[PDB]
Design an enzyme around this catalytic site. Structure first.
Site: not given
Ligand SMILES: O=c1[nH]c2cc(CN3CCCC3)ccc2n2cccc12
Length: 350
Positions: A246, A210, A327, A243, A202-203, A217
């Site tokens: 995030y 990006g 994790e 997740s 998740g982000s 990255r």
């Protein structure tokens, strides 16, 4: 006009939303007048990473005031904030720099994002969306709803999501199959590496431009080391609940994006507490952080060799751990092969 499916065009707009970039910054209290998106530079973010690392060293050293206040003033001078008739918060502890360090990370993904957007050709022949799409360097297709794949993904999402963190429910609006340009011959050599698993990542929505363009990255050496459970790497979860935290969604913006990537874990180094590793023991290729919960192992399903732990969450072997969920961490970028992108709506229980 664009020949992409609507859900795909809609995804492109989502990830290249300028407004969302500004909201994410103001939300950090960043002064937009002095530091607009256009003035964002990586070189300035690297310098801030370095000052933040310099504050942690002073904090852990226990410097005599003046030194912390100066380093703190240096950071706020490089990264313009707006707190009104109040001086910014003094960065004199671990919690305080970690929050700032995580801020820089997203601020960087926004900078990377804006760089992609504000760059390219300016013609008017092709429709923007088609242009923006091409900028991602990723082939994106829609995954049919009545597809076995979609069913798999839905079960994984529903099963690994329960009622003890159920301050919201999750509904899958769209599932996309992803193949970043080249991200094949880089992962393939690692494809000859057992223990391959389908995992979540998740982000925030403003970081996908990006992640897709450059893939996931790893933080640079200058970045502060505080906050990280198991060193600078790529963090994955085998439970959507961990997740989902995030994606940073809310009642105002209830829609996020979640990644499902194939990770060539290999023999995992199993740990129960925050460690300073990054450097694996000989014969190990990943770290597994043991959480109190884990999907029921009896309901695992390996695809093409790829393991898919969609089991419903159960108490794991040990709770003497510091984590609530599992994790998985890799320290090599070619160990990840992003396969799916999910668009999800969060229904808050409030
Ligand atoms: O799925 C996960 N996503 C995630 C995202 C962030 C935040 N990004 C870091 C750099 C920019 C924003 C941080 C930790 C995780 N994480 C940890 C375990 C599993 C995940």
């Amino acid at each position: 006009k664009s020949k992409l499916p609507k859900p795909v065009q809609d995804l492109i707009k989502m990830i290249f939303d300028v407004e969302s970039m500004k909201k994410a910054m103001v939300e950090y209290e960043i002064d937009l007048q002095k530091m607009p998106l256009g003035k964002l530079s990586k070189r300035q973010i690297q310098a801030a990473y370095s000052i933040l690392s310099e504050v942690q060293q002073a904090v852990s050293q226990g410097s005599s005031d003046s030194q912390i206040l100066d380093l703190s003033n240096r950071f706020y001078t490089l990264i313009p904030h707006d707190f009104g008739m109040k001086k910014p918060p003094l960065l004199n502890n671990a919690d305080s720099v970690q929050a700032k360090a995580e801020m820089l990370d997203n601020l960087l993904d926004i900078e990377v994002a804006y760089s992609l957007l504000r760059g390219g050709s300016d013609d008017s022949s092709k429709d923007p969306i088609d242009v923006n799409y091409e900028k991602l360097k990723t082939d994106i297709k829609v995954v049919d709803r009545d597809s076995e794949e979609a069913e798999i993904i839905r079960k994984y999402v529903k099963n690994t999501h329960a009622t003890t963190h159920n301050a919201y429910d999750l509904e899958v609006i769209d599932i996309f199959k992803i193949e970043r340009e080249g991200e094949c011959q880089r992962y393939k050599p690692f494809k000859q590496l057992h223990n391959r698993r389908l995992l979540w990542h998740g982000s925030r929505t403003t970081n996908f431009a990006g992640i897709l363009s450059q893939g996931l990255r790893i933080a640079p050496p200058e970045a502060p080391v505080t906050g990280y459970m198991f060193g600078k790497g790529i963090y994955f979860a085998d439970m959507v609940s961990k997740s989902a935290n995030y994606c940073h969604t809310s009642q105002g913006d209830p829609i996020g994006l979640i990644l499902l990537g194939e990770v060539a874990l290999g023999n995992m180094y199993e740990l129960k507490h925050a460690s300073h590793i990054s450097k694996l023991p000989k014969g190990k290729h990943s770290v597994k952080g043991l959480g109190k919960t884990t999907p029921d192992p009896s309901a695992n399903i390996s695809l093409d060799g790829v393991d898919v732990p969609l089991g419903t969450g159960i108490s794991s072997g040990v709770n003497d751990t510091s984590l609530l969920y599992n994790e998985y961490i890799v320290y090599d970028i070619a160990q990840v092969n992003l396969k799916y992108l999910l668009k999800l709506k969060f229904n808050f229980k409030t």
